Symmetry: D2
Subunit: 360 residues, 4 copies
């Protein structure tokens, strides 16, 4: 299936080989996608359109922390482990992105997983799991306990590097973005900072925005698309989570700066951060790592005022965020869920047509 560039959408910058967050070496991504039931929703009975996406910054067997920093665009949502990130500039264990109704279950499941996977002496370090959410309330039985501990273990255990599945998968399964089908998107940039190449990888769980605000490559596209409006039975709280990985050896305060750039990439695509739209970004470094109870490893150190290096990284965040958002839309297929609510994937043919008209 084509991704955004393939359909003729131009973006600046050079992607990594996978054009995904896994272009940052050692990052692993796993999804569990829960799709079951059809028709009228009854709380506790589905239909279910939900899941969880796991990102292991250093791979699933790592006990070490990664340097990290975050930013908030609009904080009407949940992302656990963030007080820790703010305070000590690192987090341990994986990042879970899921649906709002699943947060508690995923949080406890991550602890349980640690008990069976992590040495008991290290369990102490597994007590502040990182779990974030967007709300799949149109397509999913949010309160209905559709996600199980086993689903979470499967995502934790199944995570891998290499190409990342996008669209209606994992935490993104039941999401809606720009009034089209929401979901998971990812992109990366390889940036040149003088004599060194660094990678910036971004994965988004997109559940935000309005059709009439959407811009793709600067084109206000909602009015240009014909049909594809959501339906109920056949008749015609937002959020966005942004995860940024880099192999640049950044300190925590520098990673906050990286996270703060995501908003500019979001800005490019037209949304204005709704009052109840939980829009968050978290950035981590895979080269600035903190062995559990050990000496932090900082291979090289970058000056914040080194604009050559920092600007290349910041530009990478903005570009990869912009593209990750479009990649999501293009990856996400039309879906009918709870109460026969139907949300369309942004139509490829119309998008390709629009890009040709605008960028011969």
């Amino acid at each position: 299936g084509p991704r955004a560039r393939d359909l003729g959408v131009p973006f600046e910058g050079t992607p990594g080989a996978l054009n995904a967050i896994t272009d940052v070496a050692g990052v692993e991504v796993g999804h569990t996608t829960v799709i079951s039931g059809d028709g009228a929703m009854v709380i506790g009975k589905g239909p279910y359109r939900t899941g969880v996406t796991i990102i292991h910054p250093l791979g699933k067997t790592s006990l070490d922390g990664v340097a990290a920093g975050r930013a908030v665009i609009n904080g009407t949502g949940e992302w656990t482990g963030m007080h820790l990130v703010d305070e000590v500039g690192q987090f341990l264990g994986p990042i879970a992105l899921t649906g709002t109704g699943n947060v508690g279950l995923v949080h406890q499941s991550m602890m349980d997983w640690s008990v069976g996977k992590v040495p008991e002496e290290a369990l102490f370090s597994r007590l502040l799991p990182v779990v974030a959410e967007t709300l799949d309330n149109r397509l999913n039985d949010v309160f209905g306990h559709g996600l199980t501990r086993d689903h979470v273990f499967a995502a934790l255990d199944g995570a891998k590097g290499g190409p990342v599945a996008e669209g209606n998968v994992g935490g993104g399964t039941g999401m809606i973005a720009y009034t089209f089908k929401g979901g998971i998107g990812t992109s990366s940039r390889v940036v040149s900072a003088g004599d060194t190449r660094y990678t910036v990888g971004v994965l988004v769980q997109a559940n935000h925005g309005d059709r009439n605000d959407l811009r793709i490559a600067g084109v206000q596209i909602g009015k240009e698309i014909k049909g594809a409006w959501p339906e109920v039975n056949g008749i015609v709280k937002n959020a966005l989570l942004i995860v940024i990985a880099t192999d640049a050896p950044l300190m925590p305060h520098q990673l906050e700066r990286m996270a703060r750039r995501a908003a500019l990439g979001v800005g490019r695509n037209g949304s204005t951060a709704g009052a109840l739209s939980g829009e968050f970004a978290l950035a981590f470094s895979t080269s600035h790592v903190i062995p559990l109870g050990g000496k932090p490893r900082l291979p090289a150190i970058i000056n914040d005022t080194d604009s050559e290096t920092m600007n290349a990284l910041f530009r990478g965040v903005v570009q990869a965020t912009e593209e990750a958002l479009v990649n999501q839309l293009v990856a996400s297929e039309t879906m009918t869920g709870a109460n026969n609510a139907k949300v369309y994937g942004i139509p490829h043919d119309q998008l390709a047509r629009i890009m040709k008209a605008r960028f011969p």
Copy 2:
């Protein structure tokens, strides 16, 4: 039993009638205390010394929000719902204080609790439960699922106004503070705010500090207390946190409540601790008069100027004093406990405490 004042510990300011957070009208507190098993710990089998404490800002039947603001002393811990507080200056639903291992269970149970009670069209507002933790790792089987959904429902449904149980109860059950038994403490102040009085109520879940730093009424007391050192199976032995909840009936805006929360640190400072590297120390303040009807117009009965020192300083002083006293009240309320692996932590000795206070304050 005696609280700190009853042992002759002096504090400044005028407490409310209950000297508890429930002196703020309409606030309800519930505990579920889970104490079971003895001897060697096996994960999933206890012993359990844990629980959950529930605070309903406007009572358990309220669907409305309260204006709120928070502060971090040291952020190595979890407190959910706080991004919401930072952003829109309010939170819906109860505050849950619990042990670290219980956070996810309590979070999901709070959502479940709303289901069937709250109108389906209002369920959306129940999706960001406020849950905070400290770690009961020495006395409790943290990962062992000792806390059940039913325990959480019981605290949510059982909460009430009036006197608040302190000590080894609810979320404070298995906690350790200043190397003595930790737990729940509470206090209040009625403050004279210019031409009006307001109540500031504070509840703490204390799992922080070192005996050698502890000051009570300014007295460095660790060295004055004889014995009472923690034991491992009856032999003297060779991650902390502190949660502070501030309620006030002052009609404060969210940014003003952040200021209130930031005062908690000064009260903590009076008692001598220095906020350890891994010590998750947080404060959350809410107003019970600045309320936000679900999907309606905020109700702000009166408005206060941040530069009104007469009014703000009285409230700020209230936070400091009530925090300071709530911490000492916790110590006094918490009794010696033996828990997992026969780990034993002593309640600060009342007889010794009284003797010291009498000696220092004739």
Copy 3:
């Protein structure tokens, strides 16, 4: 003179009558523009291309505070009085926007201005002047004391409602934005919340961005424009200050939210916030006013979860910011300054031709 709309640039939303920050009733703006000297720069002798811009939130005679909140995109710059805003949610007195070298002079001049102007009993309230800066280092003798107390007094006293002069004036005099001439820009939006209308006014002092990132109405325009690159002798640190005024009766924490929306408007126009780019936003309400030592006046109260109202206001900030930035570019004319550095105003004829091609 033509503004961006007059050149055929499309924008969304409805501007107020003046399409300026002064569409918010009672707000006054004054500029002092200091242009003297030519040729080689010698510190203390010019040439000078600098100035100061004053914004009186409630007019120059007011001793009252306005509810306020700020946001930081990238904090490598100065903006005084902001600790006060963060703490008590208000500031007293005018906003001054100026060149980096003038901050201290402007700061003390604002205090001086209050002396005699303000009853001695109220002088306490004048001790935390709000002064912000961008760096006019290429066109101006920054350290050369080109701005005088008299210049500052003139701006304070000469400030007025009505049309706001844009371009190479006041604090924007010697600025450079997107590798074109920088300066002052302004725009406004009248926003609808049910039946209630509010105005959101924005004024920018723009000294940020690269030509190759610039996007006007989504068009990446730097590559489409021919010539107009900066020169020195005829041979071919940034910042952006955003001031947001609204007559919505917002509380301070809500105004922080408004300020955080500015970054999204900046994002639309393509920049990525350089490592040394001081990019800040300050938002204030002219209806939520705090009489000195009195009761705050809050005529109405808005629920943060009132999407209808808040989103209208948010959309307004984003739109007015986007347009203020383009208005700045269009209003700023080519200038030669210190060391014969020459910076071109973005070419009107080319911009119009490009906009006509893109938006028939």
Copy 4:
């Protein structure tokens, strides 16, 4: 003159040799103290009781930045260069502490000083002077231009290592703390983490707090001290107006350490200052601008070069961090008391008189409490 310890005030921890911020090697401190005029205040004519205190983190000739992080207890006040610190975790140039009325003058004067001392090609780095204030409004003609550029230059140029003058000097000259004479105080702690020793030095400009809240060594001492209330024209300030605690207070805390800390770790250091302040009883008034800035002298960033981080500390290394944190709390606590002891009775503008906390009484109280 005696400092707090010499009056029998006990403190925990081990001070550096100087028990001052200059126990952190290379830190230099300079004061310019402006005291002139007596009697009725006329704006523009004095009397003046003001000044400026300069702290050069790496010495007056350094062009390099220090890693830094800040904390706000109550933000009703000014401290410039702090957006820079929050964003990039360092600041260049000196810290200046002064009276509120002098902020702009000092800010511009520091730039002017740079023009003199700094290579033209490095001037770009001197654009965000760090200037902080407390308000000397009871003893000083705040708006009256008492401070001159020459005063600032003298503090900048005169700054040095070694013993740091405390009390009514530099920025502290006209200040009032706990209803006694305010001013400059300093202390340090040498802390142990394994075989590693670090120094934490603290300097404060104190203009905060009320006598009724003051605790020294945990003793609530305001009621134990007899007399020494502030006076105006020869009588004790009393009545529904003149008899209430001062507002428009402030406290500036500067923390230096030679521990190689990253900026976010220095923010944590700065947040510890509040606990030290708390020990001494104050509750941060609504208009009390109370701020802390912490910097490292070992984690330095040469201008345009690579940051130098000679060692690295894990935030979760409780042994190391807790020693440093405890160091900040203790040094802050002691600096505040050292300030009170160093500041002598002063009469200033409008014949306002503020007493230094009485040494004889303090010593007697301490001797009774700690026999």
